[model samples]
Target: TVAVIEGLATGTPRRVVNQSDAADRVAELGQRERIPRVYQKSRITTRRMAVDPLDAKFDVFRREPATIRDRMHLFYEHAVPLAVDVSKRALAGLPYRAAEIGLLVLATSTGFIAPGVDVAIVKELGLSPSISRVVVNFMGCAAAMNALGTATNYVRAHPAMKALVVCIELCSVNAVFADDINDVVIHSLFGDGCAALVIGASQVQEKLEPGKVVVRSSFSQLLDNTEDGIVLGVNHNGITCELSENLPGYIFSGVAPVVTEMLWDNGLQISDIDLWAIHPGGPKIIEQSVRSLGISAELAAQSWDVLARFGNMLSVSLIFVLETMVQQAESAKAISTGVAFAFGPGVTVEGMLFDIIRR
Candidate 1:
C-alpha cells in the first residue's frame, strides 16, 4: 500500500522582491557588478521573502547587520504562522477533518525554535494534542521528500492514520552580507515560502474522490566525495552557506544512476514515465539533470515554472512542482506516471515514483 496525497497548498510571505530590486540591494553592498551577473544567470524574476529587502531592522544585508539572534527571531515569528496557513489550506474542502490527522511531519532547514513549530501548528490548527510529531531539520532542499518518505512509512504501518507533511523555509533569513561569489549566487536563487500535503493510506481513502496522486516508492543516496558540495552552518553572523562550483557536475554524475535504480526496482524505465518533478536547485542543476537523464525539457516544465515564479524555496520547492503537476493532470483528466526528485547538502538525492489516477 502507498500514501495518497489528498490535498496540497502553498503560502508565501507578503514581501515580494523582484530581480531589479534585488540587484539594487546588491548595489548598496558595493558588489553591483556581481549581483547583476548572478541575478541574470539565475533566470528568477521574483521571490517572496519573510523580511522586506529594504527594512533595515530585519534585512541581514543592511549596514547595521542582523545577527543570528535577529534572524532566528524572524524565523520564530513567521514560520509557525506560515505553516498553519498552508496546512489549513491543504485540508480545506477535503472530507478529512483536522482531528483525523494522526501524524505531523515538519521539514525545515532555515531556523530552529524551542517547543518546535509543530506544537504551535497543532494548537493553531486544532490538530490532535497527541498527534505523532516528527521534525526533519537541516536536511536542506531534499528534506520534504524525506518527510514524505517518513509519512509514507508511517501510514503504511498504521493504515488507519492520516499524515500531514509540511515544509517551510525562510531562506531569506539566512542572507549573508558578503562579497563572495557563492553568497551572490545564493542571494539570486533562495526565497521564503511553505508548502503542505495531506496524505492518507490508499486503502483508507475510500471516502475521497477518485482522482488522487499516490506515492508508490521512494529512493535516496548520499554521493561519494562530496561533503563540501553544499554546507550551511551557524556563525556569529547567522546561517552561512558554502556551495561548491562543481556541485552541478556532481549531481549530473550521480542522479542518473540513483534514478535508474529506482525505476529498475519498479520494473520501469525512464521512457515509461510521463512527468518529472525535479527540484530546481538552480538553472544549471536542472539543465544538467535533464542532460544526464536524457529527458525532454518539457517534462520538467513545472520545475522551471516554479523556479521562475518563486526562486528556490528550498525544501518547499519540489512540493510546489508536484502541486502544479496535479493541477495540470486534473484539468486534462489524464492518467500520468512520474518521478519526483531533489538534491541537498550531503550532495544527497531523494526521489519518489508517483501515479495520478483519475476516475
Candidate 2:
C-alpha cells in the first residue's frame, strides 16, 4: 500500500517543466492546422521515470497481483519475511539481544477484512505468540509514526517491554488507470515497498538514540480535517487515487506546532536536529513540509535524495529515509541527529528523533 509512496519517496532526476524547443521540422499550417498546447508541451518536456518497482507500470505490472486483497496478501508474502529479517538485523547490531519482543506492530494504508497484516506477518515469521500483535490500518503515509507511537506506549508503560515496528506498503498495486492527469501523474510516482524496524525498551536496545546513536524520541499527531486532500479508493476495479492540488497547501499550514511539541516533549529543539528524514510525500508536499517547519535547505536536501531514488512508500517513507542514513554512515558529513516525520491518510503525521553514528 505504501510502496507507491515510497517508490516516490526516494530521489528522481528533475526534468524541465513547461519546456520549449523549436522543431527543425517547422510546418506552416496556414491556418489549416492547430495543435493543443498540451501536445506541444509533451513534445518539449521529458518527465521523470521511477527507477524501482513502485513507479514502474509495465506490461508485467498487473501480473504482480490480482485484486486489492490479493495484492495485500502477495505483498505480505514477499515483503514480510524480509522485513522481519531486517528487524532482526537492526536489533542484532545493537548491544542488547532484545531479550524478548514484547510486541509486533504492522502499519499500512491498504488493508482488507479477514486476518490482519500484523497477524499474517507474525505467522510467516514464526514469532512468539507472547509478543503482542498490533495493526495500524488505513492510516495513510504517516501511519508508521502512529504504529511507532503505539510501540512507544508499550515501552513507556511496561518499561521493560520491547516492540518491533514494521511498516509495509504495497502501494503499487493500488494504481488506477484514469484519464485524469493527476491520477496518471500519481501512477507514475508510486512503488511497492516495506520497511522493518525494532524498538527496544532499554538504551542498549534502541536503534538511533540521541548522542547514544539510537532513536531517542518519537511522536505522532493528526491535523484537523486534512484527510480529504489525499484519498485512496478501493473499488471493484481495484485501487485508485485522487490527490487534490491543495495537499501541499495543507501541509504548510500549522504543521510546526506538531513538530515543536514533539521536540519539546523529547527535551530537544529544532536547532538540535542535524538531519531531517522528511517523508518524500511528493515534490510539492516536501516543499510545503519544510516550509512549515522552517528547516533549512541543507537539512532538507538529504530527503530529496530519498525521493529521487524511491518515490514515496506512504507508510514506509520515513523508514526508507532511515535506510539511506545507514547506507551513508561512512560519509564525512556530521549528520548524526535526524528528525523523521511522515504525513498521510488520516491527514495525520508521525515524527521520530534519531541519533546516528557520525564520521
Candidate 3:
C-alpha cells in the first residue's frame, strides 16, 4: 500500500511561458497596484522565470484591472478542470477507478474556494460520493510533500484502501500588483500547476507499472519561534508575499541536520541517496539545499530544471520535481533511493524518504 505507481504524478502536459513575457505583464499589474515601477524594472525584468500557460493567460499583453474575486473565479475555472485532467491521466490504463479511491487529499496555498477543489474533483471525476476528502490549505510551497506524507500514512493505515494525492496551485492567480519588492518577487517567481497520483496496497501492486517508490518515512521541522521569514497573507487586492532576504540563509543552515537525521535513522547517509527531488523554492533555495545537503550538482539538476521551466507553483512545485525523476527513472532505471524535500513560509522544511521498488 505504500508503493506508488510510476509516472502517476504527472497529470498532463502544460504550456511553458517564458520569463521576459511574464515581466511585461507584472509591470502593467504594478502600475495598476501603484507598486513602484522600479521594483518591476529592477527585480523582475532581469531574472529568468517561467510559468504555466494558465498563469500566462491573463497576460500583461492583455492588460486589465482584475479584482481578487475576479482572479479567484478565474483560478477555480481553470484549476477545477486541471485537477480532473491530471487525475484522469494519473489513473489512465490502471485498474483503479475514481470510485475506487478511498480518500482524496488536495493541497494548495495560492487559491481558496469555499466548496474547495476536493469536492469538485470528486464530482467531476465521478469519484465515490462516500469517499473522504481533506484539503491542506495555506501551507505554501512545502505542501506537496505534506500532502504526499499524509496520503502515504493513510495508505499505511488502511492497508486495503487506495488514495489519491493532488497538489493544485494557481500561484499566478494569487498575483499582487504593488510597489513592494516581495510582490515583485512573488509575481516573478511562482507559477500555476497541478499533479495527482494513485496509491494503494503493496499486495495488489503486482499487476501495475514496473517501477514504484515505496514510502519510507517523512520528517518536518519548524525552526525556533520565527514569524515573518516569508509571509503569504490576505490583502486588500490579492494575496501578498513578504519575501525576506534571509530565506536562503535559513535553508542553508537548517537543512543539513534534519536531512541527516532522517537518513541516519533509516540506516543511511547523505551519500546513500541515489536521487534528489529537492523543491525549487527558487534558484538560491535549490543552490542552498544542494550545498547544505552535500548533494552533487548532477543529482540536483532535475530540481533546477523544474524551476527554470515552471517557476514555483507553491504546493504543486515539489511534486513536479518528483514527476521529473519518475520520468527519467523510467528510461534510465537510474533511481533506487531518493529524498523528496521542500521548504516554505513556516520557516518550515519537509522531507520524505522513498525507495524505488523494481518489478
Candidate 4:
C-alpha cells in the first residue's frame, strides 16, 4: 500500500554500535549529569528526516506533499482492513463462538501502547471477557509457530477445546532515524500484516468431503545459540528491532543441522519433501537455506513472492503462505506434500509438515 515505504522492522540498536567509541559517544547524547544513571544512549541512529510535510526538502523547497503525510499514513488504512479480511478468509466458516472459545493468542512484534491493541480487538470482535486471552508480545517472526505449537499441545490434551491465534504487526511505528545502513535495511524491508487461525480437538482435520488442509505433523526447531542474533530490546528511548548480519551463517551453523536431524528422524531427505513454504529470510538467507538443504529454486518462489509483496509480516507471514497452500490443496490435480517454516528473534525456526490427512 505504501509507495515510499510500505513496511518496517520498527528499530535497531545492534546495527548502530559500530565500535566502543560510537557506543561511548551515544552514552553522551545529553549531559552526563542529566541522563539516566543506569543506562547510556548511543549515537548510531538511522532516522534521517521525516518524509511527511512537517518541513520541506529538495527542489528548492517544495511547499508540501499534495496529500501530505506520505504513504505511511495510507498504509495504515490498509493493514487493519487487510488483517480483518484475510483473517476471515483464512477462518472461512470457522465455528468457535465468542463465548465458547476459552483462549486467544495474538502474536506480533510491532504494536503500540502498554495495555495492548489485543484488548481492544477482543471487545471489537465481541469475544467474552471470560476468555483467557494471551498476547505473545515481541516474539518476532517465529512467534506464530510458538502459538501453533502451544495450541496443538492444548488440543491434544483437552480434546474438547478450541483456541484462536491472531497476529498483526504495524512495522511503521518502529522506523529508526539513524543514518546507519543496517537500520535502514530494516526500513527497506517489512510491511504491515495480520492473521487469524483456529485450532481445536473436534475440527475433524482428517475429513475428506471437501475438507481443508489437515494438521498432520507440527514440529519445532529451536536454536539456543541463535537466541542472540534476532532480538527485540528496549530502553527509555524506544523499542529496538535488532538482527545480526551473520544471521544466515548463524542459521547454517545451528538450525540447519537440527532441521536435517529432524528430517532424518522422520526418514525423509531433501528431495523427499515435495514443497517448502519457507520463511523468506531474504535473498541471502534463502540462498543459505537452499544451499544447506539442497532445495530447488522453484520450491522457494512462493515464499519469495510473499516476501517481495508483503516483506516479513512477523510470525504471520509463514501462515499466510500456508493459508494459500491449503486453499490450493482443496483442488490440486495431485496431492501436494510440504512443510512450512518461519523464523523469529530466537533466530528460531519453526517447521511443520503436512499432507492430506487420511480418514
Candidate 5:
C-alpha cells in the first residue's frame, strides 16, 4: 500500500472577496455587457472565496479584459509558484529531499505551458533534474485522483522511490466574461487553490504527523452518452464551462454504483466508511453523493464546510475535504477509513479509499 505522508494547501492566505462582492462584480459586468438575466443571477456563488495577491492585484476579471493567452498567462503565473510554496510544506520534516524524490506528478485543468508544471516545481524545489514526471491535464475536476493513481503506481512499482503529487488550479481565471447560465454556475463556485502530497511505499514511511493516508485502492468509471453533460471550451478569453441540466441525474446514476461497488470490493459497506470525502462540486453534488450512498448528511458536512469556506478549488477541493475529514476524525476520536470521490468530464467518477493512520 502507498502511504500519503503529508498534505498542504498553499497560496496567499487571505479572504480577498466574499460572495456578495463577487455577485456585485458579476451583476455590473452583466449589465454593462447587456447580458441575459438568467445567466446573471446565480445563487451558486454565494460563499466566501480566496484570491492570491497576484490575481487580486491584476483583477483577473474585468469588463475590458485581456486576451485568452493573457488570462492563461495570469493563471500559470501563480500556478508554479504556489505549487512550490505548498510542496515545501508538504515535504517538511520528511526524511528525504528533492533529490530523493524519484517521481513528480502534477494535475491541472486550468492552463497549460511548455516543459510542464512538474518541471517548474522540480526546478523550484531543487528536485532531481532527472526526476520522472507525469502530467494529468484536461481531465476535469477529477484529475487529482488520476494524479494520485499515477503516484501510487510509481511508488508501488519501486518501493524505495518516493513520489510527489501536486494539484494547482487558479479557477478564478476561468471566471466568465459573457452572459451564459453555464458559465454563471461555474463562476459562482470556482476559486483559486493549490495542494501537494508526499506519498511513498508503506515500508519507507517513517514516523509522520496526523492524517496519514494509506491508499488502499483507486477506481474510475465513465458515464457514457453524457459527454455533453459537462464541457469546458477554450476560446480567446480563457475557458468557458457549459453545464447540462442533467448533471444531477448523472451524479445520481454514477456515484452510488462506483462508490458502493468500490467499498464492497474491499469487503466493506457504505456503513463501514467513517468519512465520505466527496468533492464539493457544488452544494447539490454533495447532496447527491449523500443520498446515493445512503449516508447521513452529517457525514457530508465536511464537504459542505469546505465549499462554504473556500468555494470549489476544482482539483484542490477534494484534498481540502480529505484534510478536514482527517481533522474531524481526531476530534471525534478514531483512526478511520475514508472514501473520496470527484466528478470529471467523462461524467467521469474517480475515487480512492484510504485508511487514516493516526499519530
Candidate 6:
C-alpha cells in the first residue's frame, strides 16, 4: 500500500497586506532607505499577516520591544484556531472521521508553547485521546515534507491507519525590524499561513479517486557547510531570521542533483514528470531551480502564482502549490505525475514524488 493524500486545505489571516502598504510600513519604521526597491524586487505583490502591520501595538519598529512572551501569546491565540480551521476543512467531506485519524503530525517554526500545538489540535478536533502524535518544530520551511514523510511511513506500516499533517506558521509575529538588507528581504517574503492534509493508504496499482494524490516516494539531503545560508532563532525581539545572499546559489547548486537522484530512484527521467510544485523560496530560488533542472517556466507556474498571492508562508507554501496544481489538473481533466520540493535551515532539500489520480 502507498500513502495517498485524500484531502487538503489552506488557511490564512483575513488581513492582506499589499506590497505598497508593506513599503509604506517600512518607510514609517525609518530604518531602511532602500525599502521600496527591496519590496519591488521581492516580486511579492501581497501577503497575509496575523497581526495587522498598521496596528501600533504590534509594530515591529516601535521604540518598545515586542517581547517573546507577547509573540508566544499571539501564537497561542491564533495558531491553534488556524490549525483547527484547516484541519476541519481538510477532513470536511472525506470518508474518514476524526476518531479514525490514528496519527497527527504537526509542523511549525514560528511559535511555541508548553504541551505544543498538537495536544490542543487533538482536543479541538475531537480526535481520540489515544491518538499518536508527532511535532516537527523549529525545522524551518522544509518541515512540512518532513512531517509528510513521517506520516507516509506510518500509513505504509499500517495500511489501515489514517494520518493528518498540519503546517502552520505565524511568521508575522516573528517579524524583525532591522537595518540589515537580509532582514529586509525576509520581511518582504514571509507571511502567516497554515495548511493541512489528510493521508491514508491505498493500493499502488489501483485507480485513485478524484482529488487524491498518491505519494510514491520521497528524497532528502542536507548540504554541507551551509548552515549559515538560512537561520531562525528566538530572542528578546521575538523570532529572528538571518539569510545569506548566497542562499539561492546554494539551493540552485544542490536542488538539481536531489531531483535527479529522486527521479532516478523511481526509474523515471526528468522529462517523464508533467507537473512541478517547487517551493517559492523566492523568485530567485524558483528561477534558479528551473534553470538548474532545465525545465520550462510553465512547470513551475503554480509556485510563482502562490508566491505572488501569499508570499512565502514557509512550510505552508509547498502545500498551497500542490493544492493549486490539483485544482488546475481536475478542471482541465488531466491526470498528472509530478514532484514537489522545498528548502530550509539546514540548507536542506526535501522532495516528494506524487501522481494525481482521477476517477
Off by over 4 Å in 4: 1-92, 112-114, 202-206, 209-211, 235-237, 329-334, 356-359
Per-residue C-alpha lDDT of model 1 across residues 1-359, encoded as one tens digit per residue: 65788788999998889977787776776336666777888979888998764676645344445477867777889888899999999999587776679999999888877787888889999988989999998889999889998888888888778899999999887776567778778878898999998888865345446457888888889999988988978866667678898888988898899999899999999988888999987899899889889988887888898998899899999988887877777234446888998887878888899987755
State every prediction's TM-score relative to the real structure.
0.94, 0.72, 0.85, 0.71, 0.88, 0.95
Candidate 2 CA-lDDT value:
0.59
Candidate 1 CA-lDDT value: 0.84
Better candidate by lDDT, 4 or 6:
6
Residue pairs clashing in model 3 are 1-200, 1-201, 1-202, 35-178, 35-179, 36-179
In order, what is each prediction's RMSD in angstroms?
A: 2.2, 8.2, 4.6, 11.6, 3.6, 1.8
TM-score of 5: 0.88
Write the residue-wise lDDT of candidate 2 on 309-358 in tens digits: 55566777777777676556534665466788877665767777766655
- For model 2, the superposed segments whose C-alpha errors exceed 4 Å read 1-66, 91-99, 111-113, 203-215, 264-269, 326-335, 357-359
Best by TM-score: 6
**Which stretch of 10 consecutive residues in model 3 shows the poorest summed lDDT?**
42-51
Clashing residue pairs found in predicted model 5: none
Q: What is the lDDT of residue 154 in candidate 4?
A: 62
Give the per-residue lDDT of model 4 (tens digit) for 283-332.
66666677667667777766776665555556767776765555455334
How well is each residue in 1-359 modelled by candidate 3, as lDDT tens digits? 44564437544225555466555554554134433343343222222212332356645522454466766666677788788888878777577765668989898776677797889988988889999888998788888777877777787788667888888877655554455656666666766678887776676445544456667788999965445677878754456667778888888888899999989999999988888888886777888898898777888888877777667677777777877766567334444788888876878888789866544
Error of 3 at 221 (Å): 0.9
Tell me the deviation in Å of residue 217 in model 4.
3.1
On lDDT, who's better, 1 or 2? Answer: 1
Best by lDDT: 6
The backbone clash count of each candidate, in order, is: 0, 43, 6, 15, 0, 0
Better of 2 and 3 by TM-score: 3
Query: For model 6, how does the per-residue alpha-carbon lDDT over 1-359 read when each residue is reduced to its tens digit?
Result: 77899989999988889998889777777445688888888888889988874577665343357477777877878888889899999999787876679999999988988786789889998999999998888788889899999999998887887999999999888776677777878888988899999999988687777778988888888998889988988878778778888888898788888899889988998888888899997899899889879888888889999999999899999999999988877234456889999887878888899988655
